[PDB]
Design a protein around this ligand. Structure first.
Ligand SMILES: [Ca+2]
Ligand SMILES: [Ca+2]
Ligand SMILES: [Mn+2]
Ligand SMILES: [Mn+2]
Lengths: 237, 237
């Protein structure tokens, strides 16, 4: 299987697989059963911001999700990324729909990674920033139903031409360049991601969510990973 | 054939193909015959710094090659890069030796690209920075004789264990993620590149040079592009 570390914006409560009974943000370490979650007051049809930090100093993964003029939702987990991920990774955005559906629109995405040797005391770094997505976006690997260029946006899941989102949809976008995330247990990268998103549903119950993830460089959408598996995990274990 | 735009650090006068009769820095638009050149007092065995800038407003490509406690060679040329390069490119470093030979050691390399949209006026950007190269550098495409990780350095051309360069050598390194250099109507990226290099020789005629180049994504070392062609060009037209 793939090795996945993720921050999930989970719209749909799957209580039979350990989700809390409400929309939530979570940190996922090699499992869709979040190691840590916080209640998320998702606003159907509003543009929100996601802010994620891995701080190598504390070995702490952090995520804040917020809407303008509302209080944020936050989650944090201590994890040795050197002991979980391979040395080289791709970073991406994933989304899914199931029986229930939502638009999974990404309007912007930025990422920074810094890896600094103890010996040199000098840093290697990668930064990209998309404020607009292009019809033929060659620095992104699109998987499943993911498309770009509609209103300059990244549509992670299938939307019809009238604007209606579709069920049983999955789609991912990975940055083309692989990212160097550790050299030893003592030298680990810090990174920062931001994205803005628009989750719109006609349904009383939107589903299933958006995730920022780090995987092995050759990661692909697992078979049957629509709905509650967020296009990340082969099963709900 | 490939489309090349390149800034050359040319250490060997090839006077039968347009070179001045001294070492020089040149701006190459689609030809090893520079559009503009400047005399360059190359210092054998000494670490130097190259700074390339392209400004999409002035439409000017500048370069500054410099050495500690010595003068700076600079060269300029106004060009409209939407006239020359494809929408998407790879950026890279190239070097070659021929009959005469030099080390083409790269100690650091950084690049920034910035593309301001027109309909919505938001910017997309790529930045990377290597202060050390490792042995399997998965964000670099190595071509020809180029290797990484010897002294934490990028060796563009073949070198022996004792540290002696070898002739009839050619090598390149391209950043793995392609770069968006222009949008359709006079919306072109500005960019900046910086590298530090050590060109060294037991000769007093070192050859043949190092170049920063921008190419079509699929570009490879042209056949018979050792020595004077800088691993950039197939013919001397
Ligand atoms: Ca769920
Ligand atoms: Ca020459
Ligand atoms: Mn969940
Ligand atoms: Mn020349």
């Amino acid at each position: 299987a793939d090795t996945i570390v993720a921050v999930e914006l989970d719209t749909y409560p799957n209580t039979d697989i350990g989700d809390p009974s409400y929309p939530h943000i979570g940190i996922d370490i090699k499992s869709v059963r979040s190691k840590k979650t916080a209640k998320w007051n998702m606003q159907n049809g509003k543009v929100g911001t996601a802010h994620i930090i891995y701080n190598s100093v504390d070995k702490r993964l952090s995520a804040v999700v917020s809407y303008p003029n509302a209080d944020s939702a936050t989650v944090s987990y201590d994890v040795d990324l050197d002991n979980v991920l391979p040395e080289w990774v791709r970073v991406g955005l994933s989304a899914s729909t199931g029986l229930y559906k939502e638009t999974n629109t990404i309007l912007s995405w930025s990422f920074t990674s810094k890896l600094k040797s103890n010996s040199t005391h000098e840093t290697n770094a990668l930064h990209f920033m998309f404020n607009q997505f292009s019809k033929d976006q060659k620095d992104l690997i699109l998987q499943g139903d993911a498309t770009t260029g509609t209103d300059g946006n990244l549509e992670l899941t299938r939307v019809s031409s009238n604007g209606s989102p579709q069920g049983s949809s999955v789609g991912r976008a990975l940055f083309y360049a692989p990212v160097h995330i550790w050299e030893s247990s003592a030298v680990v990268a810090s990174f920062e991601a931001t994205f803005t998103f628009l989750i719109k549903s006609p349904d009383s119950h939107p589903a299933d969510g958006i995730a920022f993830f780090i995987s092995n460089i050759d990661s692909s959408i697992p078979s049957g990973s629509t709905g509650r598996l967020l296009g990340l995990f082969p099963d709900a274990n």
